[PDB]
Enzyme design. Structure first.
Site, PDB file in Angstrom:
ATOM      1  N   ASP A 112      -8.759  -2.039  -6.941  1.00 37.33           N
ATOM      2  CA  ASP A 112      -8.264  -2.575  -5.540  1.00 37.33           C
ATOM      3  C   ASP A 112      -8.315  -3.452  -6.155  1.00 37.33           C
ATOM      4  OD1 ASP A 112      -7.887  -0.592  -3.461  1.00 37.33           O
ATOM      5  OD2 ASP A 112      -9.701  -0.962  -1.710  1.00 37.33           O
ATOM      6  N   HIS A 133       0.590  -1.098  -0.353  1.00 35.26           N
ATOM      7  CA  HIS A 133      -0.112   0.077   0.218  1.00 35.26           C
ATOM      8  C   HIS A 133       0.765   1.356  -0.069  1.00 35.26           C
ATOM      9  CE1 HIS A 133      -3.253  -2.919   1.200  1.00 35.26           C
ATOM     10  NE2 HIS A 133      -4.241  -1.935   0.396  1.00 35.26           N
ATOM     11  N   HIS A 154      -6.988   7.223  -2.504  1.00 32.75           N
ATOM     12  CA  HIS A 154      -8.205   6.206  -1.410  1.00 32.75           C
ATOM     13  C   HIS A 154      -7.335   4.994  -0.233  1.00 32.75           C
ATOM     14  CE1 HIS A 154      -6.319   3.036  -3.959  1.00 32.75           C
ATOM     15  NE2 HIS A 154      -6.854   1.878  -3.714  1.00 32.75           N
ATOM     16  N   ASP A 155      -5.519   5.563  -0.176  1.00 32.77           N
ATOM     17  CA  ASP A 155      -4.993   4.839   0.653  1.00 32.77           C
ATOM     18  C   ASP A 155      -4.087   5.585   1.234  1.00 32.77           C
ATOM     19  OD1 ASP A 155      -5.943   2.285   0.754  1.00 32.77           O
ATOM     20  OD2 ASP A 155      -5.147   1.572  -1.274  1.00 32.77           O
ATOM     21  N   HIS A 166       0.639   0.920  -5.524  1.00 34.47           N
ATOM     22  CA  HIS A 166      -0.496   0.769  -5.341  1.00 34.47           C
ATOM     23  C   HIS A 166      -2.037   1.753  -6.453  1.00 34.47           C
ATOM     24  CE1 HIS A 166      -4.198  -1.074  -4.662  1.00 34.47           C
ATOM     25  NE2 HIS A 166      -4.901  -0.472  -3.483  1.00 34.47           N
TER      26      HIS A 166
HETATM   27  C1  LIG Z   1      -2.225  -9.525  -4.737  1.00 33.81           C
HETATM   28  O1  LIG Z   1      -3.216 -10.345  -3.253  1.00 33.81           O
HETATM   29  C2  LIG Z   1      -4.697  -9.501  -3.398  1.00 33.81           C
HETATM   30  C3  LIG Z   1      -4.450  -8.285  -3.047  1.00 33.81           C
HETATM   31  C4  LIG Z   1      -4.998  -7.667  -2.303  1.00 33.81           C
HETATM   32  C5  LIG Z   1      -5.699  -8.248  -1.117  1.00 33.81           C
HETATM   33  C6  LIG Z   1      -6.827  -7.595  -0.508  1.00 33.81           C
HETATM   34  N1  LIG Z   1      -7.241  -8.297   0.928  1.00 33.81           N
HETATM   35  N2  LIG Z   1      -8.064  -7.515   1.349  1.00 33.81           N
HETATM   36  C7  LIG Z   1      -8.816  -9.076   1.996  1.00 33.81           C
HETATM   37  C8  LIG Z   1      -8.311  -9.877   2.914  1.00 33.81           C
HETATM   38  C9  LIG Z   1     -10.063 -11.345   3.862  1.00 33.81           C
HETATM   39  N3  LIG Z   1     -10.113 -11.321   2.303  1.00 33.81           N
HETATM   40  C10 LIG Z   1     -10.139 -13.047   2.171  1.00 33.81           C
HETATM   41  O2  LIG Z   1      -9.707 -13.513   2.991  1.00 33.81           O
HETATM   42  C11 LIG Z   1     -10.834 -13.509   1.244  1.00 33.81           C
HETATM   43  N4  LIG Z   1     -10.976 -15.134   1.448  1.00 33.81           N
HETATM   44  C12 LIG Z   1     -11.798 -16.099   1.573  1.00 33.81           C
HETATM   45  O3  LIG Z   1     -11.841 -15.866   1.926  1.00 33.81           O
HETATM   46  C13 LIG Z   1     -10.331 -17.127   1.063  1.00 33.81           C
HETATM   47  C14 LIG Z   1      -9.117 -16.764   0.259  1.00 33.81           C
HETATM   48  C15 LIG Z   1      -9.391 -15.659   0.643  1.00 33.81           C
HETATM   49  O4  LIG Z   1      -8.897 -14.579  -0.220  1.00 33.81           O
HETATM   50  C16 LIG Z   1     -10.656 -10.315   2.009  1.00 33.81           C
HETATM   51  C17 LIG Z   1      -9.811  -9.324   1.074  1.00 33.81           C
HETATM   52  C18 LIG Z   1      -8.630  -6.609   1.934  1.00 33.81           C
HETATM   53  O5  LIG Z   1      -9.022  -6.374   2.595  1.00 33.81           O
HETATM   54  C19 LIG Z   1      -6.997  -5.596   1.086  1.00 33.81           C
HETATM   55  C20 LIG Z   1      -7.585  -4.227   1.104  1.00 33.81           C
HETATM   56  C21 LIG Z   1      -8.306  -3.563   0.375  1.00 33.81           C
HETATM   57  C22 LIG Z   1      -8.627  -4.483  -1.119  1.00 33.81           C
HETATM   58  C23 LIG Z   1      -7.665  -5.941  -1.018  1.00 33.81           C
HETATM   59  C24 LIG Z   1      -6.924  -6.192  -0.014  1.00 33.81           C
HETATM   60  C25 LIG Z   1      -5.408  -9.448  -1.367  1.00 33.81           C
HETATM   61  C26 LIG Z   1      -4.693  -9.957  -2.272  1.00 33.81           C
HETATM   62  O6  LIG Z   1      -5.033 -11.897  -2.185  1.00 33.81           O
HETATM   63  C27 LIG Z   1      -4.238 -12.426  -1.091  1.00 33.81           C
HETATM   64 MG   LIG Z   2      -7.726   0.679   1.107  1.00 31.49          MG
HETATM   65 ZN   LIG Z   3      -6.320  -0.198  -2.069  1.00 27.03          ZN
END
Ligand SMILES: COc1ccc(C2=NN(C3CCN(C(=O)CN4C(=O)CCC4=O)CC3)C(=O)[C@@H]3CC=CC[C@H]23)cc1OC
Ligand SMILES: [Mg+2]
Ligand SMILES: [Zn+2]
Length: 333
Positions: A237, A84, A124-125, A88
């Protein structure tokens, strides 16, 4: 806030970016970053080029100088964390450009709204410290206490909006100075809404609301326009998995290291450390990305494309091919 100097702008304007097409969906920001001694300047120049090329700043009375002041004011407020950082948000800006213009989403919005999206990408970040919302709440951080006390759990999203409003309160960096009345109000409100919508805890409700509006030919126009904006920022995002494989894998490495640093800090403090944030699990990059593809990104992009945004089909196609590629990494391990 301290005014951008002329020397600071000149450093960005010096960047010619030969060989790069910033409007292309296969544009490579990592290669752009490698191309130079000064990646932060190149990053700013990409953002600058995108904004000017759109035709949009000029139309809303935002001069070349004010636009570049704004860009550099955003850059000052990003930190040196693995994911971040300023790269990004420049990536989200460039990607949203491609969804608007290569994907034809511009057709659903006004040009003000298109202008707002491109700018909102850069705010946004603002001031992200490499720690998610849950970390602040779990650790009873001052920042987390204030959020609970005041009733909004989107700890960082509200923080980002507050710094955005600061940059824009000086005319020299207000890319909306050319607006007044209901338009200027709409620019601030839609910018703020969009940023609040990037809290991944609200991901499902944002999606359901967009989808429900998109299916309803009698949906309120203003509401649909707003939800579209929120959805396009959300899309940017989580758009890492929609790029060509090595670009997509480099983002995944960057976020993996960032998460790990959070988990190392959580360990020290004695709070719950999730599997995705734990170095000791050494979770495979391919499984993490496939889980993210299957649980978050493929359903999201597929649903929004079928509902409404047909020109963005290439994002669904590429998620599919990247998933197959990660499955090849497993198969041959
Ligand atoms: C390049 O790769 C990624 C980039 C961003 C994010 C973000 N992730 N997140 C949440 C994390 C928790 N989440 C999960 O664990 C969802 N999930 C399951 O339920 C099963 C496996 C899985 O991935 C929801 C998204 C964020 O909050 C970050 C901040 C904003 C946007 C996306 C970012 C995740 C990435 O790769 C894992
Ligand atoms: Mg954010
Ligand atoms: Zn972002």
């Amino acid at each position: 806030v301290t005014a951008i100097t002329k020397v600071e702008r000149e450093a960005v304007l010096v960047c010619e970016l030969p060989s790069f097409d910033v409007t292309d969906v296969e544009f490579d920001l990592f290669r752009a970053r490698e191309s130079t001694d000064k990646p932060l300047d190149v990053a700013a120049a990409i953002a600058y080029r995108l904004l000017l090329g759109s035709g949009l700043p000029q139309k809303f009375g935002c001069s070349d100088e004010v636009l570049l002041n704004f860009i550099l004011q955003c850059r000052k407020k990003y930190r040196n964390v693995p994911y971040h950082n300023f790269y990004h948000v420049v990536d989200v800006c460039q990607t949203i450009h491609t969804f608007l213009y290569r994907g034809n989403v511009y057709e659903k919005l006004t040009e003000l709204e298109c202008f707002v999206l491109l700018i909102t990408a850069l705010v946004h970040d603002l001031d992200h410290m490499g720690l998610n919302n849950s970390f602040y709440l779990k650790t009873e951080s001052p920042l987390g206490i204030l959020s609970s006390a005041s009733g909004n759990t989107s700890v960082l999203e509200v923080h980002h909006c507050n710094l955005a409003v600061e940059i824009l309160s000086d005319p020299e960096s207000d890319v909306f100075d050319g607006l007044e009345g209901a338009e200027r109000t709409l620019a601030f409100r839609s910018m703020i809404d969009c940023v609040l919508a990037t809290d991944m805890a609200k991901h499902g409700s944002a999606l359901e609301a967009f989808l429900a509006s998109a299916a309803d030919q009698s949906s309120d126009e203003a509401a649909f326009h707003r939800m579209t904006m929120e959805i396009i920022l959300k899309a940017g995002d989580i758009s890492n998995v929609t790029k060509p494989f090595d670009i997509s894998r480099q983002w995944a490495m960057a976020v993996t290291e960032e998460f790990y640093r959070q988990g190392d800090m959580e360990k020290e403090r004695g709070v719950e450390v999730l599997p995705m944030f734990d170095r000791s699990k050494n979770m495979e990059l391919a499984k993490g990305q496939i889980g993210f593809i299957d649980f978050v990104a493929a359903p999201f992009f597929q649903k929004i494309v079928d509902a409404c945004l047909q020109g963005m089909q290439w994002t669904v196609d590429r998620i599919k091919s990247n998933r197959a590629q990660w499955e090849r990494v497993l198969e041959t391990r």
